[PDB]
Design a protein around this ligand. Structure first.
Ligand SMILES: [Mg+2]
Ligand SMILES: [Mg+2]
Ligand SMILES: [Mg+2]
Lengths: 51, 187, 52, 129, 175, 112
RNA sequence: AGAACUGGCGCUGCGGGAUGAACCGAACGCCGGGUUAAGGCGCCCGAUGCCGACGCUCAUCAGACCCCAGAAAAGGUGUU
RNA sequence: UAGCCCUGAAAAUGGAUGGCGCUGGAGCGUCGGGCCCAUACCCGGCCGUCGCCGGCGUCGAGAGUGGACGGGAGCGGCGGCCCGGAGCCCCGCGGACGCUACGCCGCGACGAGUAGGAGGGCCGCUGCGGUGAGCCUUGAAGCCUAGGGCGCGGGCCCGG
């Protein structure tokens, strides 16, 4: 018994939707991260351009 | 620990006969092949009756066999019995039925073969009908023994009918108190 | 009663065409209902002191 | 490095200590041969800790490695040439022993017949001159 | 209740089941202090059953939310009313603490009732907790911190044994 | 309730049990259900022919909950690696044996 | 001394109760890794060698953990 | 009024919070986060037992959860001068193990034990009927053995 939740491709033998549920939650938490890193820059950028 | 069971986990049936008869040992090899391979329930009853004891294979007379083959539908089938065939003296004429048994007696296979029937063993039964198609598997009267009239509640309980073990039948042999209301009581 | 009014209500579903589910069930867990405190506000109660 | 059999697995043994009888150190009227203790109050049958262990089927060895000699063979004691030839089709899995009653004259001949037939004999140089 | 860890104030409301006799019951409300909201909605049925004819079978709760303070930074004086049990009888008790939150002063009570009066947490019932204003305190230990320009030093400081070496050549000054 | 701890599991608690500790019975045997065949080959009479359809009847309790629950062998769970608390009094009373209503999820993740 | 209900001991080892038939956990094929229960974590004796929290208490007989192995009425301007 | 402490509070060998000791606690109460280890729980190995089986297809030609011939009509596709027709293996003559059926194999669950009851014994002792073209004065039985091994054990084999 190889373990689901621990290796891929055993899940995908039991649940094919597990992969597309998984890159959808990797695509979005990369663009929620690119948004928040840029927004935290975007406050202190013009706050430095002030100074 | 898992539970508190008082084990009955070892089932107590027979997986082989206790006999060393090497001709019954080849019928077992033939039919437990046919049990697990032909996908039929005829061959599983015949396989487990060959495992049975001499008591559990009682003899079958000739006038239970032809009485259970005067029935509607049985007009061309074969009477398979795992056990011996005897003959009633009570029966007068015999039809031309086709039988199949371990060990037909000598007067039984003379009166069957006078009428023009055919006697079979369990080897040429499988060559005839491997599935057992068109067969009336008959049984003997297994509670027909002298032993079962000694079995029951107790011979001295109410109504009981249970036939005590007396060493000799007669007056002055277990007939006095408990058996008539004058002398003591009556059960 | 529930063999008499169950046999006859079985043949009402044959003329009307449904799946009434005439078998009885135990008391289910309660439905997600909706309580209303219209007008007032709830009552503040507190444990009384000890006096003999 | 004599005749080198087929695949020899790592022999586990579960125990290498030869179960001794209880109270056998204390007496010499008691041999070391195992008898199980059937007394009502003793501590080996009742299985306390730190005491003489008692055998059960859990100590049994691996079925693919049972009766394997430490060289990897499984012995079969023979008495002459003719029942040494019964060990021709098993010579990479089994091995021969010469029994203790075979004389040094006949042991000299059946130790050369085994070498032609490529059979390991466990006591080849027993009862030499 | 064990009062494990720091306590936590809950607002719990609830009402009895609407009978064919009575529709729309009044939906009472209490103020429970408990370490989590499963204990809190169990302590609700301990007090409501002592005051009204309600029980968990014939009632339910319809809200169990943590209520917490509108000033976690202000220092407050809490006077609380108790109903603990002793070994002989049961007593009413008033008691004043001084903490930044309601739940932290009632936690400070259960530590103190176990310390002073040996009273176990199953045996003490909080009646009411409220923040009180100064010059209405009656306990002079709470009262002695009401001093603008209050000052004191720290005398005879001790801590950090074995961490700083078990074996040193150095007699550690207590300031 | 002296002998059990119980509560209401959320979606990934029932998800984690069926995957990691989920096993099935067909006839008398405790198999690893590491295929969508073995769920369909026995319990496919009820339209729940795959793994995640077996998870849907047992979280959103449906028509065939009984036959889907009896199919599962009881979860032989591991020892709780956070420790427990007192084991012999109620969860309200300070211990753990009883109903706890959403805190069983914090324990399942320690058990499983 | 004698009953009721249930569990145990007898027939049963093991972990804890220093010690032990019956208490508390837990029931046992032979091992390796992981985790725990009851119970603990100055040193015997594995583990608090945590910069643990808050108080109460000084005894010229202190106190110290289910069963369980020592105390009552009464009394103290002893301290809280 | 109630918490701790004290008075009440006396027994015979010298003595027991288990001891040593312990007073910014190694005491008491109320809590925390770590941490320790049972034959208990989880994962894995190996042994046995029990339950449900498998394989007589050794079928390298076996192939079949539907199957053929050969005729009435239609194609996609194989070779065109839009007409068209079974090839039996062979340039390799080849292809592991098995299945004491009382045997072999697979999967799953289980394993305390007195009195007691069953089963298995290729455990052992003495003697008989068969049988090993058995063994031996080129050394049998017996006994001894810091020799080498096997078996869970009963025990057994070999070396000297
Ligand atoms: Mg005894
Ligand atoms: Mg109990
Ligand atoms: Mg016995």
């Amino acid at each position: 018994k190889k373990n689901p939740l621990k290796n891929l491709r055993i899940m995908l033998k039991l649940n094919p939707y597990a992969k597309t549920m998984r890159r959808n939650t990797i695509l979005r938490q990369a663009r929620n991260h690119k948004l928040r890193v840029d927004k935290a820059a975007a406050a202190a950028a013009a706050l430095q351009a002030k100074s | 620990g898992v539970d508190i069971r008082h084990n009955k986990d070892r089932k107590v049936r027979r997986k082989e006969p206790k006999s060393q008869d090497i001709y019954l040992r080849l019928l077992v090899k033939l039919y437990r092949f046919l049990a697990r391979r032909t996908n039929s329930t005829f061959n599983q009853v015949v396989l487990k009756r060959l495992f049975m004891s001499r008591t559990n294979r009682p003899p079958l007379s000739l006038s239970r066999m032809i009485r259970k083959m005067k029935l509607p539908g049985r007009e061309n089938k074969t009477a398979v019995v795992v056990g011996t065939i005897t003959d009633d003296v009570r029966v007068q004429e015999v039809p031309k039925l086709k039988v199949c048994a371990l060990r037909v007696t000598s007067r039984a296979r003379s009166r069957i073969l006078r009428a023009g029937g055919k006697i079979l063993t369990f080897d040429q039964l499988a060559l005839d009908s491997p599935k057992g198609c068109g067969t009336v598997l008959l049984s003997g009267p297994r509670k027909g023994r002298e032993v079962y009239r000694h079995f029951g509640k107790a011979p001295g309980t109410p109504h009981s009918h249970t036939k005590p073990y007396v060493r000799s039948k007669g007056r002055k042999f277990e007939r006095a108190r408990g058996r008539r209301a004058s002398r003591g009581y009556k059960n | 009663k529930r063999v008499k009014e169950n046999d006859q209500k079985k043949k009402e579903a044959k003329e009307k065409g449904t799946w009434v589910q005439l078998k009885r069930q135990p008391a289910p867990p309660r439905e997600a209902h909706f309580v209303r405190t219209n007008g007032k506000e709830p009552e503040l109660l507190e444990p009384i002191p000890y006096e003999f | 490095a004599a005749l080198r059999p087929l695949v020899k697995p790592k022999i586990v043994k579960k125990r290498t200590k030869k179960f001794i009888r209880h109270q056998s150190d204390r007496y010499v009227k008691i041999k070391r041969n195992w008898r199980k203790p059937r007394g009502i109050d003793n501590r080996v049958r009742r299985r306390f800790k730190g005491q003489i262990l008692m055998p059960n089927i859990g100590y049994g060895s691996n079925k693919k490695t049972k009766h394997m000699l430490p060289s990897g063979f499984r012995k079969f004691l023979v008495h002459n040439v003719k029942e040494l030839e019964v060990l021709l089709m098993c010579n990479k899995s089994y091995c021969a022993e010469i029994a203790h009653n075979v004389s040094s004259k006949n042991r000299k001949a059946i130790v050369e017949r085994a070498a032609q037939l490529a059979i390991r004999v466990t006591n080849p140089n027993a009862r030499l001159r | 209740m064990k009062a494990s860890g720091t306590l936590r104030e809950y607002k719990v409301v609830g009402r009895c089941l609407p009978t064919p006799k009575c529709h729309t019951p009044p939906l009472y409300r209490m103020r429970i202090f408990a370490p989590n909201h499963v204990v809190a909605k169990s302590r609700f049925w301990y007090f409501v059953s002592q005051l009204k004819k309600m029980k968990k079978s014939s009632g339910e709760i319809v809200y169990c939310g943590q209520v917490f303070e509108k000033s976690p930074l202000r220092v407050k004086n809490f006077g609380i009313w108790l109903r603990y049990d002793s070994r002989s009888g049961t007593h009413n008790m008033y008691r004043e603490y001084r903490d930044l939150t309601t739940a932290g002063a009632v936690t400070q009570c259960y530590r103190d009732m176990g310390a002073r009066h040996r009273a176990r947490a199953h045996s003490i019932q909080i009646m009411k907790v409220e923040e009180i204003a100064a010059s209405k305190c009656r306990r002079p230990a709470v009262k002695q911190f009401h001093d603008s320009k209050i000052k004191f030093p720290l005398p005879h400081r001790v801590l950090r044994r074995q961490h700083k070496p078990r074996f040193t050549t150095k007699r550690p000054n207590t300031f | 309730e002296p002998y059990i701890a119980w509560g209401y599991p959320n979606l990934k608690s029932v998800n984690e049990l069926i995957y990691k500790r989920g096993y099935g019975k067909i006839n008398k045997k405790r198999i690893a259900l590491t295929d969508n065949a073995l769920i369909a080959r026995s319990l496919g009479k009820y339209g729940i022919i795959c793994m995640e359809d077996l998870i849907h009847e047992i979280y959103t309790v449906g028509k065939r909950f009984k036959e889907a629950n009896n199919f599962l062998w009881p979860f032989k769970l591991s020892s709780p690696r956070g420790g427990m608390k007192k084991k012999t009094t109620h969860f309200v009373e300070g211990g753990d044996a009883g109903n706890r209503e959403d805190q069983i999820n914090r324990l399942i993740r320690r058990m499983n």
